[PDB]
Amino acid sequence: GPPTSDDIFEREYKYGAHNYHPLPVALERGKGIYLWDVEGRKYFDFLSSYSAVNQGHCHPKIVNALKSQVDKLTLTSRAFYNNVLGEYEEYITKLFNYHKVLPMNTGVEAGETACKLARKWGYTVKGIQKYKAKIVFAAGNFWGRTLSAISSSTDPTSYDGFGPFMPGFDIIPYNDLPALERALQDPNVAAFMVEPIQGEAGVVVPDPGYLMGVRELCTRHQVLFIADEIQTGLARTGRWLAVDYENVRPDIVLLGKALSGGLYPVSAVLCDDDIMLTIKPGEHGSTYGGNPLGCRVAIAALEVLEEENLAENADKLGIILRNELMKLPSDVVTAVRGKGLLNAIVIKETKDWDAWKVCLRLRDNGLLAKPTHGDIIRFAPPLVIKEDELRESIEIINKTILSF
Amino acid sequence: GPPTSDDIFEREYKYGAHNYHPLPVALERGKGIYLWDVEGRKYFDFLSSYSAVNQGHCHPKIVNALKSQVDKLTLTSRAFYNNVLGEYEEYITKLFNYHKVLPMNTGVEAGETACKLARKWGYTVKGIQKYKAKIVFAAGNFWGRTLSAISSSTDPTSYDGFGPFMPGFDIIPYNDLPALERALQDPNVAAFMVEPIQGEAGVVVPDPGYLMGVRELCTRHQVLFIADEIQTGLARTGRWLAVDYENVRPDIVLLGKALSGGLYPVSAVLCDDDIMLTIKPGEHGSTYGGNPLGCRVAIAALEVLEEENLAENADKLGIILRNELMKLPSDVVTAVRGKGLLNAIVIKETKDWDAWKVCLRLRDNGLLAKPTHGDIIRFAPPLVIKEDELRESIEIINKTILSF
Ligand SMILES: *C(=O)[C@H](C1=C(N)C[C@@H](C(=O)O)C1)C(F)(F)F
C-alpha cells in the first residue's frame, strides 16, 4: 500500500534537513478551503499556506492557466523576450497604479530587490556617499531567511550562528512614529521597510494613523517607504493592500505568496520610474523571474481575487470571526486581533497549557492552525470561504478551546 | 490581432523594469531544441535558458508530472507535511550519495543556504569565534543577485551602487591552487565556494587537477568545499556533476536551474549529517521550498536526464561542436572552450565588430545565442539535440561568423 503518516514523517527525518518542526499531519490533497491527509481525513485549512492560497487550494481558473501555458512555453530566461511577461506587467502595474514592476520568484527575493533599489536610489538620486546608505526596519519584522534578511531581524533563532551581519540596517520599534522621526534625522537613510501588519510577530496591528504618519515622515525626509505586503496584500486583510485602509501610497510595494494562488513562486516589486530606473540593464536579475509560466498563473490568480470580490468577503467575514472569537472567556483568551481574514487570538497560557496543545486538538477536530508563539494562534482561512463554512469552523474552535 | 515583436518589446519597456537588455526576439512556443517567435519563425536554442532546459523545452515527461500533481496539491507550506517531499528527498540523496538535502526555490537561495550552513558549522563544529568566520570565493564567481551574493562578486555591474557589503567574504583568483593554499592559512575560514566551470565569467574551464587540489587543500585545513553546480551540474558538461571529471566529493553541492527542466524554480543543497544538522528546526526555510508540485517536477526532470543518457550525449556531441568551431580562422575566432555542451567562443572583437552583432545575425539565420562579454559568445543547446541537428546548427554558425 501507500505510505502512512508515520512513514512520511520518518522518511523526511532520514533524508531531509531538519530545518522545520511541522505539525504532525501528512497532507495529500487540497481543494478550496479543505485539506485531506493520506488517511483520507478532511480538515479546514486555517493557515492558507501562510496566506499563499488566498484563492483556496488548486483554484480551477489558476490550474487551467498553468496547464494551458505549460504545453506552449515555460522558460526563455530574460536573455530573450517572451510574449507573456509584458501582458502581466501591464496588468499588475495598472491594477496597483505604479509605473513599473520588477518580477522575482520568492518573497525574500522581492525584499532584497527593494533593498537594492533603495540603496541605488539613495546613491544616484538622493546623493548619499557610497557606501553610507542606511535602511531602517521595525523590530519584530520578518521578510525571509537570506543573510541580509536575518541581519534586520530581532529574533535570535533567525540570526544566531549566522553572522557576521549586513551593515547599514537599523532597527526601531514598530508602531512608533517618534522613533521613526528620530531615525530619519540622518540624511544617509535611504528607506524604511515595514509590514502594515506584522504577521510572523503574531498579527501585530499598529495603531490607527501609524501608516499615514509613516508616509508623512518618509515624504518629508526624502526617504523611500517600502511596504512589505507579501503576507498582508492581495485581499487577505479585506483590501487589495493593507495600506489601503489609510489611503497610503508607499514608494515600493512588495507582493508574493498569494500572487500565484500557491501554484508557482512569483513575487513582485512595484514602484514608479524615478525609483525603478535607477537599476540599469545587467545590474539585477533572476533566472526564473518573469518566466511566462509564472506570469500566466499570476494573471489568473489576480483575476480570481478581483472577479470573486474576495477583499469584500474577507472584510465582512473577518468581522464575524473576530466578533465570535471575542465571546470566548477572558480567563482563556486574552485578546483577539486582526483585519479581514488575517486574525489571531492570545491564550492565557499556563505552565501545563499552551498554543501547540490547542492546535493539536484542533487538528484532532478537523481544523488546521499553527501557533506563532507559546501563547498566540493564527486563524487565516482561504478567502473563498463562505459564512456557513466559517461558522462551522468557529464552532470547532469554540468547542476545542473550552474542551480544555 | 496578436502583438508583433515590436509591440512586445515596447510594452515591456513601458511597464517592466529595465534590469535586462535582451536579444530582440519575442518567443511564444518552445519544444525540445527549438523556439518559435510570434511571427512564426523557428530557431535553434543555443542558450537553453542558461542551462535550465537541459531536457529541452516542455519535455513531455516533466509536463505530465506537473499536470498530474497540479490537480492534487501544490502548497501546504512547511507548517505541515506533504506526501511528496520525502519521496523526492530519498530519490535525490541516493542519486548524488549524500545523507540529506535542503530544498529551496532559486539558485541564489541555495547559495545563501550553503553560506549559512558553512558559518553555522564553522562556529558550532570547527570552533571559530563568533562572528569571525570567512568564506573564500574565486574571482569571476557568480551565484546570484542578493546583497550577499554580489558582495563576493568581482564584476562591478553586479555590486556597484548596492553596498555597503556583507563582511567575511574573501576573494582569490580562480584556477589557482597556490592562492587557495595561502588563503586557507587563516583558521577562521569555514568554506571555499567555487564553480567547477565558471559559466557567467565566459565558460572559464580550470586546468586538469584543479578540483582534486581544491579537495586536498580543503580537507587538509578543515575547510568545507562547496561546489556550485547550479549551472554545470545535471549532465550539461557530460556528467551528473562537473566535479565527477576529477572524481572528487565536495562537502556541499548546490543544484538549481535544470533540476526542474525549466518548469518550476527548484534548487537543492546536498550534504552529509555532520554539516546539514547544524541547522535546527526554525533556523532556516522558505515558503515555497519543498512544495509538492516542485518536487514532482524535479523527480521527473532527474529521471529524464538518467533515462535518456543525456550526460553521454552531451559529452559526445560537445567535442564535435568544439572541434568544428576550432576550424574557423584565428583572425575571427581566437579561442574555443568548454566541457560537454557548455561551450563558448572568443571572437577577435574590433571597434566595428562585436559579439552582439554576431548574435543579432545568428538570430537572423535561425539560431539564438547570447554574448557574455563584448567578445564571448556562449553555445549551449539542450542536451536532447541530435548529431544531425548539431551539424545543421554548426553550418549556421559557420555561415554567420564568416559572413562578416
Ligand atoms: C545561469 O547559469 C547564469 C545566469 C544566472 N545565474 C541568472 C541569469 C540571469 O541573469 O537572468 C543568468 C548564466 F551565467 F548566465 F548562465
Side-chain angles (χ1 to χ4, degrees), chain A residues 27-300:
Chain A
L27 301 167
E28 200 213 325
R29 189 160 63 88
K31 197 141 218 79
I33 65 173
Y34 293 119
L35 285 164
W36 290 263
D37 73 9
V38 299
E39 281 82 25
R41 291 169 289 186
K42 177 148 96 154
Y43 305 84
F44 284 111
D45 183 355
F46 264 64
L47 186 70
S48 292
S49 302
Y50 298 111
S51 295
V53 295
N54 287 358
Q55 300 88 342
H57 297 270
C58 298
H59 190 285
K61 188 206 238 269
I62 314 179
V63 166
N64 291 132
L66 186 83
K67 297 175 110 157
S68 176
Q69 186 60 46
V70 74
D71 291 305
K72 294 173 180 143
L73 180 66
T74 72
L75 183 61
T76 54
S77 86
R78 312 288 311 273
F80 311 125
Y81 297 79
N82 70 75
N83 67 309
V84 183
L85 174 54
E87 190 175 322
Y88 163 74
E89 291 179 335
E90 177 168 12
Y91 180 61
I92 189 177
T93 57
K94 295 217 250 241
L95 178 60
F96 293 93
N97 211 272
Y98 287 90
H99 289 162
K100 284 183 164 60
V101 68
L102 198 157
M104 299 296 279
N105 311 284
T106 61
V108 71
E109 283 184 336
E112 293 263 2
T113 302
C115 287
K116 283 175 76 172
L117 285 164
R119 287 168 165 199
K120 194 90 162 193
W121 173 92
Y123 300 128
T124 61
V125 176
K126 190 168 179 177
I128 300 168
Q129 180 183 96
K130 296 150 82 162
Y131 285 104
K132 316 297 174 172
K134 300 164 121 203
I135 298 179
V136 182
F137 299 83
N141 71 85
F142 176 84
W143 57 282
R145 304 284 217 162
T146 60
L147 291 172
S148 300
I150 73 187
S151 297
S152 65
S153 175
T154 56
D155 178 11
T157 292
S158 283
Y159 62 80
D160 271 353
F162 292 131
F165 304 105
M166 167 64 55
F169 287 177
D170 293 340
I171 302 170
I172 62 169
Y174 194 49
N175 190 34
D176 192 334
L177 292 174
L180 180 59
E181 180 175 60
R182 292 197 294 277
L184 301 195
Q185 300 308 299
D186 183 353
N188 290 331
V189 172
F192 177 52
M193 181 177 153
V194 70
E195 297 156 75
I197 294 167
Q198 289 190 334
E200 172 79 21
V203 187
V204 178
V205 182
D207 297 326
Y210 176 64
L211 300 179
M212 190 171 54
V214 169
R215 173 71 277 170
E216 176 173 335
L217 284 168
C218 287
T219 299
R220 173 178 300 141
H221 298 286
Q222 212 198 345
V223 167
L224 302 187
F225 177 1
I226 304 163
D228 185 347
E229 296 250 14
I230 287 155
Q231 174 136 250
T232 57
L234 305 177
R236 164 62 54 184
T237 70
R239 303 280 191 276
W240 273 115
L241 301 174
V243 291
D244 295 340
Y245 274 106
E246 296 186 14
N247 290 353
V248 158
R249 182 177 197 257
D251 295 297
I252 304 176
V253 168
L254 316 181
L255 303 167
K257 289 198 172 99
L259 183 59
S260 73
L263 269 77
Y264 201 102
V266 184
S267 64
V269 177
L270 294 155
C271 60
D272 287 342
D273 280 344
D274 285 356
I275 299 167
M276 192 73 86
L277 296 183
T278 63
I279 290 187
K280 310 301 185 203
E283 295 179 353
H284 187 68
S286 168
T287 297
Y288 280 83
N291 73 83
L293 187 57
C295 284
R296 281 292 183 211
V297 340
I299 293 169

Side-chain angles (χ1 to χ4, degrees), chain A residues 8-9 11-23 25-30 38 47 49-50 52 57-58 63 66-67 70-83 85-87 89-90 93-94 99-102 105-106 108-109 112 115-116 119-120 123 130-131 133 145-148 150 157 159-167 169 257 260 262-265 276-277 279-288 293 368 370, chain B residues 8-9 11-23 25-30 35 38 47 49-50 52 57-58 63 66-67 70-83 85-87 89-90 93-94 99-102 105-106 108-109 112 115-116 119-120 123 130-131 133 145-148 150 157 159-167 257 260 262-265 276-277 279-288 293 368 370:
Chain A
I8 289 171
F9 301 156
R11 184 172 47 180
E12 280 201 30
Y13 190 82
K14 182 170 299 141
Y15 301 107
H18 296 180
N19 52 316
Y20 281 102
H21 192 296
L23 198 82
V25 198
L27 301 167
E28 200 213 325
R29 189 160 63 88
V38 299
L47 186 70
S49 302
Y50 298 111
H57 297 270
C58 298
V63 166
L66 186 83
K67 297 175 110 157
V70 74
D71 291 305
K72 294 173 180 143
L73 180 66
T74 72
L75 183 61
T76 54
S77 86
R78 312 288 311 273
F80 311 125
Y81 297 79
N82 70 75
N83 67 309
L85 174 54
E87 190 175 322
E89 291 179 335
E90 177 168 12
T93 57
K94 295 217 250 241
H99 289 162
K100 284 183 164 60
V101 68
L102 198 157
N105 311 284
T106 61
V108 71
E109 283 184 336
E112 293 263 2
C115 287
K116 283 175 76 172
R119 287 168 165 199
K120 194 90 162 193
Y123 300 128
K130 296 150 82 162
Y131 285 104
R145 304 284 217 162
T146 60
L147 291 172
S148 300
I150 73 187
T157 292
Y159 62 80
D160 271 353
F162 292 131
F165 304 105
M166 167 64 55
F169 287 177
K257 289 198 172 99
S260 73
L263 269 77
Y264 201 102
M276 192 73 86
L277 296 183
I279 290 187
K280 310 301 185 203
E283 295 179 353
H284 187 68
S286 168
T287 297
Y288 280 83
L293 187 57
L368 296 175
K370 212 233 299 190
Chain B
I8 285 162
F9 308 152
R11 180 173 52 184
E12 283 205 34
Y13 191 91
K14 191 174 170 57
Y15 300 107
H18 299 358
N19 51 316
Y20 286 92
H21 186 54
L23 195 72
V25 60
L27 293 323
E28 68 166 59
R29 193 166 82 82
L35 292 159
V38 295
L47 176 66
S49 305
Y50 294 119
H57 293 275
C58 300
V63 171
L66 171 51
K67 282 184 157 179
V70 74
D71 288 325
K72 292 200 188 77
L73 214 214
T74 71
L75 181 70
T76 59
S77 84
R78 306 296 305 272
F80 317 118
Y81 292 84
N82 75 75
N83 68 304
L85 173 56
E87 183 171 343
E89 294 178 330
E90 174 163 13
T93 53
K94 296 193 169 173
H99 294 155
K100 285 187 164 54
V101 64
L102 200 155
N105 314 283
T106 64
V108 72
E109 290 184 333
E112 291 269 350
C115 289
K116 287 173 76 171
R119 284 171 170 198
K120 192 94 161 194
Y123 299 126
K130 304 170 164 323
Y131 282 112
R145 302 285 206 164
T146 59
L147 293 173
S148 295
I150 68 190
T157 302
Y159 67 81
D160 184 7
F162 294 124
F165 300 101
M166 159 71 53
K257 294 203 163 112
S260 68
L263 265 73
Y264 203 99
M276 191 72 92
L277 297 186
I279 285 186
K280 315 298 191 213
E283 294 172 0
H284 191 60
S286 167
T287 301
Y288 278 86
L293 187 54
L368 296 179
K370 270 227 94 193

Side-chain angles (χ1 to χ4, degrees), chain B residues 131-377:
Chain B
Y131 282 112
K132 297 175 145 36
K134 302 294 209 70
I135 303 171
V136 178
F137 302 80
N141 71 91
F142 182 82
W143 55 282
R145 302 285 206 164
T146 59
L147 293 173
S148 295
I150 68 190
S151 286
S152 67
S153 176
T154 60
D155 180 4
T157 302
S158 294
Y159 67 81
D160 184 7
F162 294 124
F165 300 101
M166 159 71 53
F169 294 171
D170 287 359
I171 309 177
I172 61 165
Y174 191 54
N175 188 36
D176 192 336
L177 291 173
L180 179 61
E181 180 168 48
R182 170 165 78 177
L184 298 196
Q185 297 314 113
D186 178 1
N188 291 329
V189 171
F192 176 54
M193 184 196 288
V194 65
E195 294 152 75
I197 296 180
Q198 288 184 332
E200 208 281 329
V203 190
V204 183
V205 179
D207 299 334
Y210 177 60
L211 299 180
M212 275 187 64
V214 169
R215 171 72 276 170
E216 170 197 281
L217 284 164
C218 284
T219 293
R220 179 185 306 166
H221 297 285
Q222 200 190 10
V223 169
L224 303 182
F225 169 16
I226 300 163
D228 184 347
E229 298 255 8
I230 287 156
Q231 154 72 238
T232 55
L234 306 181
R236 165 58 57 181
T237 66
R239 301 285 189 274
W240 275 112
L241 303 173
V243 297
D244 296 342
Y245 275 103
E246 313 225 338
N247 199 359
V248 296
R249 187 174 192 265
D251 298 296
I252 305 177
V253 172
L254 313 184
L255 298 174
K257 294 203 163 112
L259 181 58
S260 68
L263 265 73
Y264 203 99
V266 182
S267 64
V269 178
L270 295 152
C271 53
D272 284 347
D273 283 337
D274 283 355
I275 297 159
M276 191 72 92
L277 297 186
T278 59
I279 285 186
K280 315 298 191 213
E283 294 172 0
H284 191 60
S286 167
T287 301
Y288 278 86
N291 73 87
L293 187 54
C295 289
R296 285 289 185 209
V297 167
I299 293 170
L302 294 163
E303 289 173 343
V304 164
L305 299 164
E306 181 55 88
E307 290 194 21
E308 303 189 18
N309 286 164
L310 293 187
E312 287 84 352
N313 193 58
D315 200 2
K316 262 177 291 270
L317 296 198
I319 191 68
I320 292 168
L321 181 55
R322 287 188 298 282
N323 284 336
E324 299 295 340
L325 294 166
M326 287 181 217
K327 294 170 178 176
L328 296 165
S330 314
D331 313 58
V332 200
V333 175
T334 62
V336 175
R337 61 204 181 217
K339 285 209 201 186
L341 282 168
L342 178 56
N343 296 284
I345 64 174
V346 188
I347 61 160
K348 182 174 282 292
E349 178 185 15
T350 83
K351 207 31 82 185
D352 321 298
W353 185 63
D354 52 25
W356 187 262
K357 291 169 179 187
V358 174
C359 289
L360 282 177
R361 192 167 296 186
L362 282 172
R363 170 205 63 173
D364 294 342
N365 293 329
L367 183 150
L368 296 179
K370 270 227 94 193
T372 206
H373 290 79
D375 59 344
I376 301 173
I377 295 165

